[PDB]
Amino acid sequence: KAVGLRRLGQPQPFDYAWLKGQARALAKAPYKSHKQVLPGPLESLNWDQYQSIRYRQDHALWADGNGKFQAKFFHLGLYFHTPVHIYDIVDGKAQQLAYDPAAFDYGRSGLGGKQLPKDLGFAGFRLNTRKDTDRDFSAFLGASYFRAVGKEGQYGQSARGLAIDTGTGGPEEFPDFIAYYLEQPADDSDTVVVYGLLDSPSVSGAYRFAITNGEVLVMDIDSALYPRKAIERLGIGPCTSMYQTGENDRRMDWDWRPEIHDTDGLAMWTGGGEWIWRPLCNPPHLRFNMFVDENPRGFGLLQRDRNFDHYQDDGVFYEKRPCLWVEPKSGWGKGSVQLVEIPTVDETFNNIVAFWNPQAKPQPGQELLMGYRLYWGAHPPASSPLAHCVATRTGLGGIVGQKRSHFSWRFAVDFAGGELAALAKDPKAKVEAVLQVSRGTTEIVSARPLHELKGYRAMFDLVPPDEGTQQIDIRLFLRANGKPLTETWLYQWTPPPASERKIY
Amino acid sequence: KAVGLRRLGQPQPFDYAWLKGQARALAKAPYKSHKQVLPLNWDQYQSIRYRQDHALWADGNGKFQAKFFHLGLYFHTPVHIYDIVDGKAQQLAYDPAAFDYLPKDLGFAGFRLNTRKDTDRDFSAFLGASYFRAVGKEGQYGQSARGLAIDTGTGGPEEFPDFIAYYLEQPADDSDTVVVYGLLDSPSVSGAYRFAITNGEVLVMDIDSALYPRKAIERLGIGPCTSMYQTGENDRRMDWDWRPEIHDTDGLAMWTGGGEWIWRPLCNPPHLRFNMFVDENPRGFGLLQRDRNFDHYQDDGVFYEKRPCLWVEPKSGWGKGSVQLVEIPTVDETFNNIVAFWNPQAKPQPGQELLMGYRLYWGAHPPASSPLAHCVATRTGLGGIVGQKRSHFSWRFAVDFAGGELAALAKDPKAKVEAVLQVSRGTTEIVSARPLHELKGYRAMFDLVPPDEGTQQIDIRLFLRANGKPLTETWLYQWTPPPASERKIY
Ligand SMILES: OC[C@H]1O[C@@H](O[C@H]2[C@H](O[C@H]3[C@H](O[C@H]4[C@H](O[C@H]5[C@H](O[C@H]6[C@H](O[C@H]7[C@H](O[C@H]8[C@H](O[C@H]9[C@H](O[C@H]%10[C@H](O[C@H]%11[C@H](O[C@H]%12[C@H](O[C@H]%13[C@H](O[C@H]%14[C@H](O[C@H]%15[C@H](O[C@H]%16[C@H](O[C@H]%17[C@H](O[C@H]%18[C@H](O[C@H]%19[C@H](O[C@H]%20[C@H](O[C@H]%21[C@H](O[C@@H]%22[C@@H](O)[C@H](O)[C@@H](CO)O[C@H]%22O)O[C@H](CO)[C@@H](O)[C@@H]%21O)O[C@H](CO)[C@@H](O)[C@@H]%20O)O[C@H](CO)[C@@H](O)[C@@H]%19O)O[C@H](CO)[C@@H](O)[C@@H]%18O)O[C@H](CO)[C@@H](O)[C@@H]%17O)O[C@H](CO)[C@@H](O)[C@@H]%16O)O[C@H](CO)[C@@H](O)[C@@H]%15O)O[C@H](CO)[C@@H](O)[C@@H]%14O)O[C@H](CO)[C@@H](O)[C@@H]%13O)O[C@H](CO)[C@@H](O)[C@@H]%12O)O[C@H](CO)[C@@H](O)[C@@H]%11O)O[C@H](CO)[C@@H](O)[C@@H]%10O)O[C@H](CO)[C@@H](O)[C@@H]9O)O[C@H](CO)[C@@H](O)[C@@H]8O)O[C@H](CO)[C@@H](O)[C@@H]7O)O[C@H](CO)[C@@H](O)[C@@H]6O)O[C@H](CO)[C@@H](O)[C@@H]5O)O[C@H](CO)[C@@H](O)[C@@H]4O)O[C@H](CO)[C@@H](O)[C@@H]3O)O[C@H](CO)[C@@H](O)[C@@H]2O)[C@H](O)[C@@H](O)[C@@H]1O
Ligand SMILES: OC[C@H]1O[C@@H](O[C@H]2[C@H](O[C@H]3[C@H](O[C@H]4[C@H](O[C@H]5[C@H](O[C@H]6[C@H](O[C@H]7[C@H](O[C@H]8[C@H](O[C@H]9[C@H](O[C@H]%10[C@H](O[C@@H]%11[C@@H](O)[C@H](O)[C@@H](CO)O[C@H]%11O)O[C@H](CO)[C@@H](O)[C@@H]%10O)O[C@H](CO)[C@@H](O)[C@@H]9O)O[C@H](CO)[C@@H](O)[C@@H]8O)O[C@H](CO)[C@@H](O)[C@@H]7O)O[C@H](CO)[C@@H](O)[C@@H]6O)O[C@H](CO)[C@@H](O)[C@@H]5O)O[C@H](CO)[C@@H](O)[C@@H]4O)O[C@H](CO)[C@@H](O)[C@@H]3O)O[C@H](CO)[C@@H](O)[C@@H]2O)[C@H](O)[C@@H](O)[C@@H]1O
Ligand SMILES: OC[C@H]1O[C@@H](O[C@H]2[C@H](O[C@H]3[C@H](O[C@H]4[C@H](O[C@H]5[C@H](O[C@H]6[C@H](O[C@H]7[C@H](O[C@H]8[C@H](O[C@H]9[C@H](O[C@@H]%10[C@@H](O)[C@H](O)[C@@H](CO)O[C@H]%10O)O[C@H](CO)[C@@H](O)[C@@H]9O)O[C@H](CO)[C@@H](O)[C@@H]8O)O[C@H](CO)[C@@H](O)[C@@H]7O)O[C@H](CO)[C@@H](O)[C@@H]6O)O[C@H](CO)[C@@H](O)[C@@H]5O)O[C@H](CO)[C@@H](O)[C@@H]4O)O[C@H](CO)[C@@H](O)[C@@H]3O)O[C@H](CO)[C@@H](O)[C@@H]2O)[C@H](O)[C@@H](O)[C@@H]1O
């Protein structure tokens, strides 16, 4: 039977307006690092020691009550040298939770009998239903990172509170959540509300996360930001994923597993009403791309291929990993969805980052309010009502069985859904591939039924305009009678250098 | 309505003994070339179409007919075609009335056979040198057979026999079989063949051959299967194409005289590889297209997943010899870069008569396979624990098996299944055998550390075992390790 948790200090009145006040005040002073040298035995644990530490079910927050949820806490150490102070809100008042050795099984860490302060803090927290106390439906841990899962329960990509100067070629600035306030839900509530205080060299913030667990998990998020400095590249709603290899891009096809990625595309629903699918790549050099928009309806990183046959990893279940969809609340005005793709040689590094960059540079003293909903699960809650891109495949161009007189690259793009089944069965149906390329030229263009999918396949060869490796953008959709039949496929290709072209 | 075909000369008595007689006399005399200067793009060649009004047997009441290929393009060796009726052969003339666009004795390039019900579908086609093809139910042409291979994969020049005449025996009206006789000639050898062809879901050819060496032969190949393997999970060295699997066949299957079932995955190696599997009284061998899932191939024009498996079953005990496999590097699917055949231990000698009979099966599945679990996938890549510094180069293999009693073992937490793994050189590490529930089978994984910096072929033998007995056919993989320069990049 669970016990009450050890506390620190007395309850203090708490609400979102109060937290926005703390964050604004925090931005009025220069940034001071929150990283600490931890007490001696804690400062240099190894992986094995750290991993053996376990938070005890009998000290899980709220598990002594009658509600549907509970929380457990991650211990500091190993990677986590920035204390996070955790508070419980009851009747409108926030009480800090003490670091309590009785709440941990220390395993092989050697931490028992050390004299660790009551104000040590934590590394983060995780939430669990009371019906299923070993399953984490969300986990907030490290910097401003957090993750959640839907029904399938397999962890994959991450979100963050905020991204700053990702992919600039210069150094990235990583904000931290330095405090979390967990609001005790009503006994019959399906929601857990968590508040977060964020600080970073450039900016402070106050965050409210209303987390509703479900088959697709939803978080209703409000953020109030208070810059301390001008910010070159602010990133709202950042999604953080990994793409090593797959049909979209076989450059790093060194593995026996054919698809290795936590997500395979960036999806966008534009203010103008367009649906876009942008297949993720693993490029040879860092690539930064922006998609200009105004009042965006949504963007996110999806794991659209959910067929185990294409992944084959019965250890980590890539095909079950969640989509993450960002849905702006209200109008965010002008800006761009931005995508950073970093080269990676393996699947241990998150080489994909996507976020929203406002047009206007934030300025010291200003308040910036940004709200959105995040959906985690097998499918985003919104998608194109037209046919979706269900596969992208590429390879060396040129008519098979003829001499090849020049370098080109071949693309095959498969669409299914909407009304393509009926069109594919109509021998008179005329479907037009619509192609626009940033540079270079297309040849051997076709759009034809793909009966095996009850869909359509577009194929084209792309001839780069020169011997250089400047990125080439291709926009493709299918159409009939004044209406698009598909969402828009937007691919960004880094041509090979002349030396590689010569081998071909 | 179809008309009778233009003839040439008068019917002469014909039987198999006569044909054997013509072949042996051909072989005793000096070889005379049959390539002729004929009295043209690949696209431009098909303007020529043999017409149905002139199709052989289309004016009768039987189940089958023949039409003929025109000499041209890749075909400059005339084939004389004959119709056998009541024990008598009569040559068919070259007739311009029979084509849609030249002497009566110009000859043809070969023939194709059709049911009367589907006169545009051909279920067999004999065309080019001694090559021929057939299809089963799915109708999609793929790998080829030949009458004979000579000096394939020697590092010297190959010699390619020609069928120089075919005698088509008019079937009885209710027969399900077409019998075709072939006269083969080649610098080294002449032959008389009999092909009993029985169309069906899996098409069967019952073949008898009688071979007369004109001179000693260095490498005789009997029952040759000729295929293509560009890229796929077995070997992604040439992964240039958007299509992930490109091959007419994915493995060599062998049923040995001792009763072993072997699956040898085909590769597209960087240099020619010649491999032999010593056997005695082989029970069968062939090239299979075992992966039949369109999803893995994606070509909705030529349907690699529907192409036929070719299985050879000797009608008798062929004694000692070897199944031989030749793999040639290719950068495209148009080159036939895979050849497998039986090579008898004994060197053929001038004056001798070699009688060899066998059955060929063309269709979706071989008519025989292991009753144990099959290898249903081979995948390979860079070895080493993922995301760790590597002290040494290694290559990782994942091999999936399904069938036999593996589904029951996979569900059974008490089940003790072990991978048994031998390599001809180097060492193996990080070896496992575990249920693959998504398949209801097992997966074996291992890493292989090549012994040195060089690229000498390594042979790997794998099977799964419980209580001392095999649970699977034998997986036999021949790996060419990458050179040092490639390892540095890894
Ligand atoms: O083929 C191949 C070739 O090719 C070429 O190229 C080309 C190309 O082609 C390609 C393709 O293309 C395509 C195209 O495309 C396009 C696209 O399209 C798209 C689409 O769209 C479209 C649309 O469409 C539509 C449709 O409509 C259409 C129609 O249709 C129809 C159909 O019809 C068809 C037909 O059908 C039929 C069939 O059957 C048949 C068959 O056939 C087949 C074939 O076969 C062939 C072959 O092949 C093969 C091969 O193999 C072979 C061989 O050969 C080889 C050689 O051999 C030799 C030997 O060799 C040896 C060696 O020796 C040597 C040496 O070596 C050495 C060694 O030794 C050593 O060791 C080493 C060391 O190291 O060294 C070395 O060196 O050397 C020396 C030197 O010195 C030498 O001398 C020597 O020789 O050795 C070795 C070792 O030992 C060995 O192993 C070897 O062997 O030798 C010997 C002795 O001497 C000799 O004799 C031999 O010869 O070799 C050479 C060299 O290398 C090579 O090269 C060769 O190759 O031979 C042998 C013997 O004889 C044999 O046996 C074998 O087999 O190969 C492979 C492997 O590798 C295999 O696999 C194969 O198979 O070949 C031959 C020869 O040539 C011939 O004859 C034959 O024929 O094939 C195919 C393929 O695969 C298949 O498929 C088939 O099947 O045949 C038979 C006979 O046999 C007969 O009988 C039968 O009949 O099929 C079916 C099924 O099965 C059936 O049923 C039928 O019947 O067909 C045809 C043909 O193909 C076609 O054409 C047609 O089309 O039909 C159906 C039913 O009925 C119907 O329904 C339909 O309708 O049609 C029309 C008319 O035409 C049209 O017009 C129309 O279009 O429709 C459908 C339904 O509805 C729908 O869906 C659709 O859509 O349309 C529209 C309009 O409207 C349009 O616009 C449009 O476009 O669509 C789709 C869907 O969606 C898609 O997918 C597609 O894509 O498009 C695009 C745009 O967008 C474009 O761009 C494109 O182009 O198309 C077209 C029409 O369009 C087509 O035509 C074409 O095709 O493609 C593919 C892929 O995918 C590929 O693959 C191909 O290639 O094309 C182009 C264009 O046109 C052109 O230009 C040209 O050219 C190449 O050139 C060549 O090369 C080859 O050959
Ligand atoms: O493999 C498996 C398979 O089989 C099959 O069956 C088959 C068979 O096989 C078998 C084998 O056989 C062997 C033999 O043995 C036997 C014997 O024989 C005999 C004969 O008789 C026969 C007949 O004949 C005929 C002929 O024809 C031939 C040819 O001729 C040519 C010529 O030359 C000649 C030679 O031959 C001789 O020898 C000599 C003498 O002096 O003379 C000469 O002249 O030349 C010309 C010019 O150049 C030409 O034109 C011709 O063609 O040759 C070939 C090659 O060598 C041979 O083969 C043949 O035979 O012709 C003649 C005329 O000249 C006539 O008259 C005769 O008649 O035929 C029949 C049918 O028609 C049959 O039936 C019979 O048999 O005779 C001869 C004489 O002439 C003698 O010499 C011989 O010896 O017989 C016996 C009794 O009957 C028996 O028993 C045996 O068997 O031998 C041969 C020779 O040496 C060889 O070659 C063969 O191979 O045997 C084995 C045992 O070991 C077995 O196992 C097998 O089976 O064969 C047959 C024949 O060819 C056929 O017909 C059949 O078909 C089956 O069917 C399946 O199923 C299986 O799988
Ligand atoms: O963004 C979308 C989501 O919005 C959520 O709703 C939010 C709401 O966002 C609005 C936004 O609100 C802005 C605000 O305009 C309000 C106006 O505010 C007056 C305020 O009245 C509020 C009250 O304020 C208390 C005050 O807290 C403020 C805090 O004070 C500091 C204190 O914390 C500190 O200790 C000391 C010492 O350092 O300094 C003080 O300055 O400072 C922060 C940061 O600046 C402010 O955000 C806090 O308001 O503290 C004093 C004590 O010091 C209290 O006496 C006072 O009550 O708080 C109430 C909740 O407790 C709240 O309901 C009241 O609105 O009062 C101050 C004076 O005290 C006055 O100057 C503000 O103008 O209120 C009117 C209602 O009459 C609203 O119509 C108006 O929108 O202005 C502040 C200051 O500039 C902004 O920071 C704030 O963003 O306005 C947007 C329109 O432009 C609107 O679109 C947003 O929805 O903000 C409130 C307040 O922060 C939140 O409580 C609320 O949750 C929705 O719930 C989501 O669904 C949306 O997605």
Residue numbers in the entry:
A (entry chain A): 30 to 533
B (entry chain B): 30 to 68, 74 to 135, 145 to 533
Give the exact sentences the study uses for this entry:
Three glucan chains were observed in this structure. Subsite −16 is located near subsite −1, which appears to be suitable for cyclization. Consistently, electron densities at subsites +1 to +6 are obviously observed in the complex structure. In contrast, in XccOpgD, W76 in α-Helix 3 is likely to be important because this residue forms a stacking interaction with the Glc moiety at subsite −16, and this is consistent with the W76A mutant displaying no cyclization activity (<0.1% specific activity compared with wild-type XccOpgD).
In this report, we discovered that XccOpgD, a GH186 homologue from X. campestris pv. campestris, alone converts linear β-1,2-glucan into CβG16α specifically. CβG16α is classified into osmo-regulated periplasmic glucans (OPGs). CβG16α is vital for the pathogenicity toward model plants, Arabidopsis thaliana and Nicotiana benthamiana, despite the nonproduction of CβG16α not affecting the fertility of X. campestris pv. campestris.(3) In detail, CβG16α suppresses the expression of pathogenesis-related (PR) proteins and callose accumulation in plants.
